[PDB]
């Protein structure tokens, strides 16, 4: 038999490699992934271990030329899920790490302050631009800044009276999907 397993996500961290993920057949044991380089010949997943559980990992030989794939989940032998995609549609960079911040200036009234948030580009870096986000801790909407190329960015006019939250996500320059957010950095003036 099989059960009801389904694809969750396929992700490319740097547009060179990617892996696809799915759920458990509920565990049963006869699951497989097959892929094809067309819209033809179906070949089994080349690596069921590198990307972890219920995953298939495709090394950089799969992004030699513009790719155009299709994959299907298999339980015993019967399809249970399918998906087609190119590596471009799934690019999703890793977030920055080591978020820091220094005070830059205080307004004449001491009411406001300017800071500079800094971070390190994910260690696997396709040129990335970052989108910094912040908001009052006690608030619920996140203010967003334009994507920037530098691994730092000044944030102007924060109110001294408040405690802030900062988070930066990575994105491929141009049409690029965003990736996960970094570890939240707390800013108390």
UniProtKB/Swiss-Prot annotation:
The segment(s) forming the Fibronectin type-III domain are: 95-189
Please tell me, according to the UniProt entry, what happens when changing residue 123 to C: In LARS and GHIP
Q: Where is this motif: WSXWS motif?
A: 178-182
Localisation per UniProt entry: Secreted
Cystines in this chain: 10-20, 45-56, 70-84
Impact of altering residue 180 to D?
A: Found in a patient with idiopathic short stature; uncertain significance
List the glycosylation sites: 59, 100, 105, 138
Residues on the membrane's Extracellular side span 1-189
Its biological purpose is as follows: The soluble form (GHBP) acts as a reservoir of growth hormone in plasma and may be a modulator/inhibitor of GH signaling.
Q: What is this protein called?
A: Growth hormone-binding protein
Note the residue range shown relative to the complete protein: 47 to 251 of 638
């Amino acid at each position: 038999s099989s059960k009801e397993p389904k694809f969750t996500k396929c992700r490319s961290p740097e547009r060179e490699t990617f892996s696809c993920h799915w759920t458990d057949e509920v565990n049963l044991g006869p699951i497989q992934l097959f892929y094809t380089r067309r819209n033809q010949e179906w070949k089994e997943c080349p690596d069921y271990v590198s990307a972890g559980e219920n995953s298939c990992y495709f090394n950089s030989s799969f992004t030699s030329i513009w790719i155009p794939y299709c994959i299907k989940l298999t339980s015993n032998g019967g399809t249970v899920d399918e998906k087609c995609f190119s590596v471009d549609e799934i690019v999703q960079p890793d977030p920055p790490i080591a978020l820091n911040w220094t005070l830059l200036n205080v307004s004449l009234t001491g009411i406001h302050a300017d800071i500079q948030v800094r971070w390190e580009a994910p260690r696997n870096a396709m040129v990335l631009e970052y989108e910094l986000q912040y908001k009052e801790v006690n608030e619920t909407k996140w203010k967003m800044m334009d994507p920037i190329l530098t691994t730092s960015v000044p944030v102007y006019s924060l109110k001294v009276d408040k405690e802030y939250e900062v988070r930066v996500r990575s994105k491929q320059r141009n049409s690029g999907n965003y990736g996960e957010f970094s570890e939240v950095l707390y800013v108390t003036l």
